Amino acid sequence: GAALTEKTDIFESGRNGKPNKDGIKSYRIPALLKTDKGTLIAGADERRLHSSDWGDIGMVIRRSEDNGKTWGDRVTITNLRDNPKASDPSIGSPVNIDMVLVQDPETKRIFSIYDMFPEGKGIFGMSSQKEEAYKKIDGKTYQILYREGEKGAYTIRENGTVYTPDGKATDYRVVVDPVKPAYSDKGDLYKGNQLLGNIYFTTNKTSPFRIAKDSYLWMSYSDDDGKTWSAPQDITPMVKADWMKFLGVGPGTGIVLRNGPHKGRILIPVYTTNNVSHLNGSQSSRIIYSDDHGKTWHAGEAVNDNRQVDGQKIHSSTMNNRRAQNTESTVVQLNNGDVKLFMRGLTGDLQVATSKDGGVTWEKDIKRYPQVKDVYVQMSAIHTMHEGKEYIILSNAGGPKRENGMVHLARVEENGELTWLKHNPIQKGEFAYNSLQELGNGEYGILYEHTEKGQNAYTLSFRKFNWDFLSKDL
Numbered sequence: 001g002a003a004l005t006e007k008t009d010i011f012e013s014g015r016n017g018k019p020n021k022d023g024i025k026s027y028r029i030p031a032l033l034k035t036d037k038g039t040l041i042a043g044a045d046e047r048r049l050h051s052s053d054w055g056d057i058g059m060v061i062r063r064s065e066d067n068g069k070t071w072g073d074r075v076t077i078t079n080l081r082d083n084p085k086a087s088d089p090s091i092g093s094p095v096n097i098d099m100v101l102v103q104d105p106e107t108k109r110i111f112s113i114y115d116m117f118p119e120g121k122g123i124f125g126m127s128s129q130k131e132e133a134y135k136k137i138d139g140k141t142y143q144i145l146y147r148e149g150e151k152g153a154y155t156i157r158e159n160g161t162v163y164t165p166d167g168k169a170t171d172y173r174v175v176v177d178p179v180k181p182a183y184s185d186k187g188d189l190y191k192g193n194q195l196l197g198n199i200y201f202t203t204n205k206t207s208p209f210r211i212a213k214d215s216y217l218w219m220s221y222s223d224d225d226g227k228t229w230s231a232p233q234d235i236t237p238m239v240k241a242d243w244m245k246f247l248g249v250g251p252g253t254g255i256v257l258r259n260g261p262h263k264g265r266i267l268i269p270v271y272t273t274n275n276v277s278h279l280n281g282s283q284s285s286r287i288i289y290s291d292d293h294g295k296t297w298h299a300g301e302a303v304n305d306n307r308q309v310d311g312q313k314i315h316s317s318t319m320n321n322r323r324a325q326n327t328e329s330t331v332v333q334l335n336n337g338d339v340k341l342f343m344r345g346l347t348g349d350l351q352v353a354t355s356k357d358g359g360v361t362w363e364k365d366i367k368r369y370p371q372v373k374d375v376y377v378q379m380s381a382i383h384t385m386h387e388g389k390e391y392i393i394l395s396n397a398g399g400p401k402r403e404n405g406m407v408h409l410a411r412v413e414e415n416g417e418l419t420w421l422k423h424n425p426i427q428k429g430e431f432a433y434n435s436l437q438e439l440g441n442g443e444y445g446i447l448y449e450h451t452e453k454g455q456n457a458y459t460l461s462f463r464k465f466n467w468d469f470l471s472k473d474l
């Protein structure tokens with residue numbers, strides 16, 4: 001008989017707009033990862049001030065060693081301190097938002113890659129004008145600092161020493177090696193031995209320096225099964241092109257290729273916007289990857305690059321076409337070596353791109369599956385084997401709006417084609433972002449967004465189900 005466990009709340013939001021027991025109003029953006037040790041890591045955005053995509057947001061996780069039955073206390077990966085002088089608290093804090101979790105099967109290192117924005121309104125507060133964020137000097141990439149009244153770009157060098165645009169050291173220094181809990185001291189700006197402010201503050205500043213106002217990508221990793229995490233690493237320069245406006249991850253759980261010429265490659269879903277149409281018509285999915293176990297990262301090409309739309313070719317850097325957009329996505333590798341990218345879009349149904357070269361380039365045929373509705377919200381999908389047959393499990397809202405969570409089952413053939421077999425409900429009422437993981441022995445787990453009884457968006461809950469729940473009619 002079909003089996004589905006009762007929902008268990010992992011990250012509890014407050015209700016009626018009030019903070020929860022820990023003084024936090026909202027939780028969002030679930031990530032679920034089953035590690036080599038069998039541990040379950042549930043990650044999420046800890047949105048203290050409100051549910052919006054900005055403000056004071058920490059990257060946190062909880063661990064379960066009994067396959068989801070019980071969970072340990074919250075573990076904070078990164079939580080930047082707010083600007084104590086910001087006029088509007090709701091938007092007065094440097095921001096981290098949306099994470100992707102994944103573990104290297106060989107080194108066992110667990111990665112959490114997430115967005116970073118200096119103080120502001122995140123993706124909804126990006127400037128119309130670009131500001132250079134890095135500058136190369138003698139084969140050395142340094143992060144730039146701007147000072148009001150001066151056009152020249154200062155730079156942060158060894159030991160966090162701030163250098164003038166002319167190449168001279170100053171008495172200013174940045175905390176590049178934070179040591180406080182959650183690394184809340186990262187970016188602190190000192191003059192001599194006195195703390196003046198923070199390079200991530202953009203308003204009512206007390207120090208002379210700030211980084212470029214742009215979208216960044218950070219990475220933290222754990223070598224102890226998620227118990228402790230390293231200080232944030234800025235990987236933005238390795239993958240963000242000069243034309244890119246926004247560059248962020250497609251939240252959830254990434255993968256490591258299991259077969260093919262690119263086996264071992266780590267894939268992280270991401271998406272960008274350009275300066276032509278930004279959020280109106282340029283959101284384009286793609287992936288970033290690492291072939292050296294997370295040491296260095298590289299950007300693949302966008303699904304939209306050289307894509308044919310209405311008889312004409314477009315590019316992710318210049319496009320202005322609402323319906324041709326593809327944003328957050330989930331990635332899966334098939335046994336035939338192909339990489340499938342299920343992308344959140346505006347067609348009303350499931351859009352999927354296919355890569356034959358480890359995720360670098362994408363084939364011309366972007367298939368749509370009317371069998372799986374898409375109300376324009378994040379989704380997750382995972383590869384799975386059952387009785388010698390290859391399948392794909394995908395979960396997302398069934399509609400009309402972000403509600404009625406569904407778990408779709410598809411059969412994968414040798415040519416990589418998909419055949420949707422079943423569509424079973426898993427959660428009534430509100431349902432949004434989710435993250436699926438195979439637990440083994442025919443069981444699966446899912447961390448998802450849901451609310452009820454007046455809960456703030458959202459409360460992240462966990463459920464487990466087996467094959468009987470997937471196939472047989474409920």
Ligand SMILES: CC(=O)N[C@H]1[C@H]([C@H](O)[C@H](O)CO)OC(C(=O)O)=C[C@@H]1O
Nearest residue numbers: 029053097098115122123248279327
């Ligand atoms: C970085 C960021 O803002 N991510 C947010 C995402 C984004 O705003 C959208 O993809 C832009 O089109 O939207 C949503 C959402 O619930 O729909 C929550 C995500 O945290």
